[PDB]
Amino acid sequence: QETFXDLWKLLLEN
Amino acid sequence: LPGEGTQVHPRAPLLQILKVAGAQEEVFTVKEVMHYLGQYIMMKQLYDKQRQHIVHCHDDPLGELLEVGSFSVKNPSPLYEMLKRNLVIL
């Protein structure tokens, strides 16, 4: 149920 | 791809996508490029509405740069490969 915005922020910061 | 801090200049097709997402600069860090790419995908609602780690970029200028019809945020290699083709390191 995770949103795109949360998923991309995880990618961005990783 | 360069690390944190290193400055890059996007080639015109990528710069245009970033400008759509609200970018006003011409020189970026890679993280800033990723910020505006996420903004673009979000604003244009290219993510799959039910499985939101999937991005459907076919029939969009972003897909012409990525060279794929869809990708997974959890399998970001097509994104990184696109950035290597479309960022000039300063």
Q: What is the DSSP string of B65-78?
A: HH-SSEEETTS-HH
CATH number at residue B55: 1.10.245.10
Say whether A2 and B31 touch across the interface (CB within 8 A): no
B28/B19 Cα distance (integer angstroms): 12
Tell me which method was used to determine the 3D structure: X-ray
Read off the DSSP letter of residue B59: T
Task: Give the closest residue to B61 by CA, choosing from B10, B15, B24, B27.
Answer: B15
Pick from B31, B34, B41: CB nearest A4? B41
B38/B42 Cα distance (integer angstroms): 6
Read off the DSSP letter of residue B5: S
Pick from B31, B35, B52: CB nearest A7? B52
Structurally, chain B folds into a number of domains equal to: 1
Deposited resolution, Å: 1.5
Using a CB–CB cutoff of 8 Å, tell me whether B56 touches chain A: no
B62/B41 Cα distance (integer angstroms): 9
Burial per residue of B44-68, b for 16 or more beta-carbon CB atoms within 10 angstroms, e otherwise: bebbeeeebbbbbbeebebbebbeb
Looking from the CA of B13 toward its CB, the CA atoms found within 13 Å total 12
Say whether B52 and A4 touch across the interface (CB within 8 A): yes
Residue B13 near residue B61, CB atoms below 8 Å = yes
The domain of B10 spans: 1-90
